[PDB]
Design a protein around this ligand. Structure first.
Ligand SMILES: N[C@@H](Cn1oc(=O)[nH]c1=O)C(=O)O
Ligand SMILES: N[C@@H](Cn1oc(=O)[nH]c1=O)C(=O)O
Lengths: 260, 260
């Protein structure tokens, strides 16, 4: 038995530094949905682990020129980590290089606006220019727009890829800050899960509008051929069946919601 | 290359006999969401196939005494079929004996009532006796209640397992007929997907109430170790990414909805 190296990302409310993190060591420094999930998975699979934050702060994308994978995906591909326990979207391109457990959370791409912004759908965004809109870099949302053959999403892609100044952000935190400080002139395309969490955080000035653009899920990832995959997949199914995953979502999204 | 034997179930709107089925042969006799899905999967994976309806008309459950698997699950386990393309729920007990692709549809257990029935939640059902309620036999919904540790669902299970006359039905069709003919005295616990489909079918006398009890998905299943699994999983992800699965749901649930 060896300590399993877990790669994850600082993304609220999945993994966050505890307020008193300076007083603590190792795994105890962190808290969140994925921190709780990691503890449950490890217990069910019988392994000890070490939580580590992805070096480049990215989810995972492959460079067009170099063909090299970055982010958490890259850490699994190059063997820097043994497993990824984070809001990592199950996609075809990633499934080609790493393995995923069945989903532990269901979600879809959505729109976040500053309250009062006159936008109710992706269709609305695509038909105008005054309100800028973008996505996070190196993730599944940007890749969705890049590869979409659907007219509305492709129209949106053509605008976003050449928009000036850049409409892309490095992290969810940056996109949220841009929505909040742009006086309604910036809308942010992000996963419904993040959108719903932020909607319940002070200053309660944002909101999710329209239906989700797609239906997909987050999965726990392991390098291809990992001996860990099977047990991890069964653990996820068990936790879902026990209602534990639902309990964890309520805990981190709503029980402590700050917007009444 | 050999013809792949597909096991499926006659369940609207997934697989149904075409009205003019007598005039047709083989795969052409059927139509529906899963019929369309099977054609797409076969095309993407490069195989020819034969659609067959599960002999016992069941989804799949293991006998407590004999330990023998029935339904579509049983057909894969005993090698009577090469793959299952139907609304087969991904569960822990099934994952122990067969393989599943990532989900092609997202859903949850829900409540179906005859319009006007004074029930808005599972909590409501559990606190009364006048309105009987049950589930389909040999499926994931009955197993959910049987294994639940959650107070409300366990209370519901204790009532259902000993209710008289029996509250369990053999098929969705039977449960729907019971809801419709029981004058509000029977509520039916079934997957949200089936519930939403029936809600748009004449005589438009049923409705889904409350939130879903859980969050899970349907997957394409193959016997353990099947050489088909990998390609099938990637095909499902591709179809989802192209928006084809969403298009298919709209086609079979709403485009031809009969309730305005
Ligand atoms: N879970 C996403 C990361 N990301 O979060 C969003 O909200 N959009 C986006 O791309 C991924 O795995 O790439
Ligand atoms: N998809 C279910 C079958 N079934 O359909 C429902 O609506 N409930 C139920 O158990 C299964 O795979 O067992």
């Amino acid at each position: 038995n060896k300590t399993v190296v877990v790669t994850t990302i600082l993304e609220s409310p999945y993994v966050m530094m505890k307020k008193n993190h300076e007083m603590l060591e190792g795994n105890e420094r962190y808290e969140g949905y994925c921190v709780d999930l990691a503890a449950e998975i490890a217990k069910h699979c019988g392994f000890k682990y070490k939580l580590t934050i992805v070096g480049d702060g990215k989810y995972g994308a492959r460079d067009a020129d170099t063909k090299i994978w970055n982010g958490m995906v890259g850490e699994l591909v190059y063997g820097k980590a043994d497993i990824a326990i984070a809001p990592l979207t199950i996609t075809l391109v990633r499934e080609e290089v790493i393995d995923f457990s069945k989903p532990f959370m269901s979600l879809g791409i959505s729109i976040m606006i500053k309250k009062g912004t006159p936008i109710e759908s992706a269709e609305d965004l695509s038909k105008q220019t005054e309100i800028a809109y973008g996505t996070t870099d190196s993730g599944s949302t940007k890749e969705f727009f890049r590869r979409s053959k659907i007219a509305v999403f492709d129209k949106m892609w053509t605008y976003m890829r050449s928009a000036e100044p850049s409409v892309f952000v490095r992290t969810t935190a940056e996109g949220v800050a841009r929505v909040r400080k742009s006086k309604g002139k910036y809308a942010y395309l992000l996963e419904s899960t993040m959108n719903e969490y932020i909607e319940q955080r002070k200053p309660c000035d944002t909101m999710k509008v329209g239906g989700n653009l797609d239906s997909k899920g987050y999965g726990i990832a392991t390098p291809k051929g990992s001996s860990l995959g099977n047990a991890v997949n069964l653990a996820v199914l068990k936790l879902n069946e026990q209602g534990l995953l639902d309990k964890l979502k309520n805990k981190w999204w709503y029980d402590k919601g700050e917007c009444g």
